[PDB]
Write an enzyme that holds these catalytic residues in place. Sequence first.
Site, PDB file in Angstrom:
ATOM      1  N   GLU A  35      43.695  83.874 -41.206  1.00  0.00           N
ATOM      2  CA  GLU A  35      44.089  82.736 -40.676  1.00  0.00           C
ATOM      3  C   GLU A  35      42.909  82.020 -39.935  1.00  0.00           C
ATOM      4  O   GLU A  35      42.511  81.068 -39.985  1.00  0.00           O
ATOM      5  CB  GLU A  35      45.241  82.789 -39.672  1.00  0.00           C
ATOM      6  CG  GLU A  35      46.615  83.032 -40.594  1.00  0.00           C
ATOM      7  CD  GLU A  35      46.947  82.035 -41.380  1.00  0.00           C
ATOM      8  OE1 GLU A  35      46.208  80.836 -41.523  1.00  0.00           O
ATOM      9  OE2 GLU A  35      48.025  82.181 -41.906  1.00  0.00           O
ATOM     10  N   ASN A  46      45.555  69.936 -42.297  1.00  0.00           N
ATOM     11  CA  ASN A  46      46.511  70.261 -43.490  1.00  0.00           C
ATOM     12  C   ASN A  46      46.628  68.639 -44.400  1.00  0.00           C
ATOM     13  O   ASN A  46      46.423  67.631 -43.666  1.00  0.00           O
ATOM     14  CB  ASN A  46      47.989  70.625 -43.359  1.00  0.00           C
ATOM     15  CG  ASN A  46      47.762  72.026 -42.752  1.00  0.00           C
ATOM     16  OD1 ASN A  46      47.148  72.991 -42.935  1.00  0.00           O
ATOM     17  ND2 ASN A  46      48.657  72.102 -41.527  1.00  0.00           N
ATOM     18  N   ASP A  48      49.043  66.894 -45.359  1.00  0.00           N
ATOM     19  CA  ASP A  48      49.989  66.243 -45.045  1.00  0.00           C
ATOM     20  C   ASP A  48      49.838  65.506 -43.575  1.00  0.00           C
ATOM     21  O   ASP A  48      50.501  64.697 -43.131  1.00  0.00           O
ATOM     22  CB  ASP A  48      51.511  67.028 -44.887  1.00  0.00           C
ATOM     23  CG  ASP A  48      51.328  68.289 -44.015  1.00  0.00           C
ATOM     24  OD1 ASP A  48      51.569  68.203 -42.831  1.00  0.00           O
ATOM     25  OD2 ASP A  48      50.724  69.364 -44.547  1.00  0.00           O
ATOM     26  N   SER A  50      49.127  67.302 -40.778  1.00  0.00           N
ATOM     27  CA  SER A  50      49.390  68.287 -39.737  1.00  0.00           C
ATOM     28  C   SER A  50      48.104  69.017 -39.467  1.00  0.00           C
ATOM     29  O   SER A  50      47.084  68.975 -40.441  1.00  0.00           O
ATOM     30  CB  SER A  50      50.579  69.124 -39.751  1.00  0.00           C
ATOM     31  OG  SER A  50      50.335  69.724 -41.171  1.00  0.00           O
ATOM     32  N   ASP A  52      46.670  72.855 -38.022  1.00  0.00           N
ATOM     33  CA  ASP A  52      46.855  74.432 -37.828  1.00  0.00           C
ATOM     34  C   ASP A  52      45.892  74.856 -36.632  1.00  0.00           C
ATOM     35  O   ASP A  52      44.592  74.505 -36.512  1.00  0.00           O
ATOM     36  CB  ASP A  52      46.644  75.236 -39.023  1.00  0.00           C
ATOM     37  CG  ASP A  52      47.566  75.219 -40.033  1.00  0.00           C
ATOM     38  OD1 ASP A  52      48.704  74.647 -39.931  1.00  0.00           O
ATOM     39  OD2 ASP A  52      47.405  75.857 -40.975  1.00  0.00           O
ATOM     40  N   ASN A  59      51.197  75.656 -36.825  1.00  0.00           N
ATOM     41  CA  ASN A  59      50.859  74.137 -37.426  1.00  0.00           C
ATOM     42  C   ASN A  59      51.781  73.240 -36.562  1.00  0.00           C
ATOM     43  O   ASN A  59      53.001  73.462 -36.077  1.00  0.00           O
ATOM     44  CB  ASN A  59      51.677  74.571 -38.703  1.00  0.00           C
ATOM     45  CG  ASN A  59      51.483  73.259 -39.697  1.00  0.00           C
ATOM     46  OD1 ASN A  59      51.454  72.149 -39.163  1.00  0.00           O
ATOM     47  ND2 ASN A  59      51.692  73.363 -41.015  1.00  0.00           N
TER      48      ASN A  59
END
Length: 129
Positions: A35, A46, A48, A50, A52, A59
């Site tokens: 990660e 991301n 969309d 958002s 992380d 998220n």
Amino acid sequence: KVFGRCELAAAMKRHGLDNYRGYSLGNWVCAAKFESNFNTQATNRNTDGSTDYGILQINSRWWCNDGRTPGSRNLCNIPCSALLSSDITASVNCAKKIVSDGNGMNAWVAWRNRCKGTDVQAWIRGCRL
Ligand SMILES: [Cl-]
Ligand SMILES: [Cl-]
Ligand SMILES: [Cl-]
Ligand code: NA
């Protein structure tokens, strides 16, 4: 902060992740490796909209507030920026809530695709712990 492999395992163990919801310590270290490459400051956008955040790439769509993810939730009731500290406490506490939510560690895409079903014990091999 960029954690060493055994350093993070110990920190995660201290914070109660070893066998949390049946997930051995190796699973958590593996997830963190892929990660964030063990980097507490890691952030990634991301598609969309958002973002992380941190060692476990939590998220903003569901788990934290960054004030720039329209329609999202803040289920861990924290600012996303608190997930970027050198102290992993906030990330761990939120991770415990995430992994309890239904689909276990499958919530972490990198865990599912890179850790799940593998020899995860290798991640804590030779570590004091
Ligand atoms: Cl460092
Ligand atoms: Cl393990
Ligand atoms: Cl820590
Ligand atoms: Na928001």
